[PDB]
Structure 1
Amino acid sequence: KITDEEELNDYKLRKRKTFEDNIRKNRTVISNWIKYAQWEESLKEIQRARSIYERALDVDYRNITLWLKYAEMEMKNRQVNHARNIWDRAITTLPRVNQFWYKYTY
C-alpha cells in the first residue's frame, strides 16, 4: 500500500526507469513505446505520453498502429483538438493508408 505522493513518485521513478531502459536496448521494437505510453495514459500524465509517441514517431513514422494509438489516446482523453491535429498530420504523411482517412472522417 502506497501513501502520500513521495511513494507514488518513487513507484513512477522505478517504472519510468524500467521502460526507458527497455527503450535504450531495443531502440526500435515499437511495442516497448506503446506499453510505456499506455502506462503514462493510465495515470493521466498524458503530456509524458505525447512525448513518448512523438519520440516513437521520430523512430518510425511509417508504422501505422503507432499513429492509431497516439490518435486514440488523444480522442479517448477528450482532447478532440490534439487528435484532430494528429489525424491531419497522419493523412498528410501516410496518405495511401486508408485506415487514417476512415477513422478521421468517422
Structure 2
Amino acid sequence: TAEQLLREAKERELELLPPPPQQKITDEEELNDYKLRKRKTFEDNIRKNRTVISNWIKYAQWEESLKEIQRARSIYERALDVDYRNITLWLKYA
C-alpha cells in the first residue's frame, strides 16, 4: 500500500506548473493580439495534420466565439471545403 500510495502522492505532485491567468482582456487591442497569437497556434495545430478533426472543431468553437461571423465563416468554410465525405462534420458546421 505504501508503493501505490507513494505513486499517488508522487503522481499528484508530478503536475507541471499551474496556469498563469493574469491580465485577462486588458490594454485594449492587446487582447486582439493575444487572440492573434491563439489563432496562430490553432492555425499551426490545424497545419500539423490536414486530417485533424478535433483541432478543426476547437477552431470552430473558439472561432464562432471570438471571430464573430466573418472569420468564423472562414473556419467553417475552410474546414467544410476541405471535407467532402464524413458529412457528420458538415452537420457540426451546419
TM-score scaled by length of structure 2: 0.65
Superposed structure 1 runs of 4+ greater than 2 Å apart = none
CA distance in structure 2 between the aligned counterparts of 1:45 and 1:16, rounded to whole angstroms: 13
* Equivalent residue number for residue 44 of structure 2: 21
Higher Cα radius of gyration:
2
Higher relative contact order (CA 8 A, sep 6+): 1
Residue segments in structure 1 that go unaligned for 5+ positions in a row: 72-106
Matched residues, number: 71
CA distance in structure 2 between the aligned counterparts of 1:53 and 1:7, rounded to whole angstroms: 26
Does structure 1 retain, via aligned residues, the 8 Å contact 2:80–2:93? no
CA distance in structure 2 between the aligned counterparts of 1:64 and 1:57, rounded to whole angstroms: 9
1:32 matched to 2:55: yes
* Equivalent residue number for residue 9 of structure 2: none
Residue segments in structure 2 that go unaligned for 5+ positions in a row: 1-23
RMSD of aligned Cα (Å): 1.6
TM-score scaled by length of structure 1: 0.59
What displacement does 1:69 show?
1.6
- Name the % identity: 100
